[PDB]
Symmetry: C5
Subunit: 89 residues, 5 copies
């Protein structure tokens, strides 16, 4: 077990996590993130897993989401920064 | 275990997922979704009568997403967009 | 053996009595036509003891995810406040 | 041996004590007549108070507690807010 | 187990949790906290944001499945606080 995390933003919309297993914990926006909808999806086919917005819902708790690498996280919408936290087992 | 997901919207209000188990994880709205209440329900047949069970109510400006916990379903299961224009995304893990 | 379950509570039918079995709750959410006011659902048992488990409101918090709540029938769900409809979803396992 | 449990905290009754036994918390939610202000519930041990929830009628009327299992005795204190604030849980033994 | 908790604020932005495992339960703001975004991150250097709160938007958050092996430092990346973190020290 090793705490893990990544940041997605306008300039770096994608992050890839390349046995091993990643359990997600939270997704949250930076305080300087544009006040608009942010959507993070997992790409393998893309699957939206979270929709956040600073003035509406600044974060979300992920539960029971365990992924087998490799997995790519893409910022479908929003300027970010958007942080994803998890445990790399 | 295989990550799964579907989109429901005004055009396609229904998605029929057809030993297997589907564990739901999240429900979230698209950024272009109409700012109104969206309701997703699971539909099954009960006593020869249709029975739908609402599992989530979302709205862009109020609650753009929800985390589903402990919801494991045995196919076949139909997800219906009871209300809202969508798009509404449902994510889950399809384990077989 | 599991079976998806659910019920609606509203002004007209403020109560629903769910009559080895266990009911695991999953979510509580409001209908889109529900009055924009606070809705409170409570579980009622004889000890009469009622235990509030959720407070919702259309314009504030339209739904809630229930976790680790497993009940042994019989159990009654009562709409303490609000016009509804308020839906409760769960899994009835046996 | 599980038994649904619950208590109400308010301005006049800021404290409630839960006096092997285990209490698993499920939800915290405000009454519809609760003052539109921040409500904070904390667990107190001897003291040692630990805030576990911050609610407000017009902002966040309730919260789902997860994985919180307590060994009696435990005291719940309404650090702030008029209430009523309800705490639900499963008392097993 | 042993219930645990700490407060982070403008004047005490950091708290270090010095086999043992800390399971987090909730993060919530004090009623006197400045109405602005508060961000708490875990630091190991690698800092990992785990929560973004704001009094008038989202006053608290439930942490799930987050179990940590000491030592672990919690840092208030942003916000005046107070911000409370609750957990079970097993």
């Amino acid at each position: 077990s090793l705490i893990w995390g990544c940041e997605l933003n306008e300039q770096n919309k994608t992050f890839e996590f390349k046995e091993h297993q990643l359990a997600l914990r939270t997704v949250c926006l930076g305080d300087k993130a544009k006040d608009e909808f942010h959507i993070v999806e997992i790409v393998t086919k893309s699957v939206p897993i979270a929709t956040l917005k600073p003035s509406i819902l600044p974060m979300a708790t992920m539960v029971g989401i365990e992924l087998t690498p490799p997995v790519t996280f893409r910022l479908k919408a929003g300027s970010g920064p958007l942080y994803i936290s998890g445990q790399h087992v």
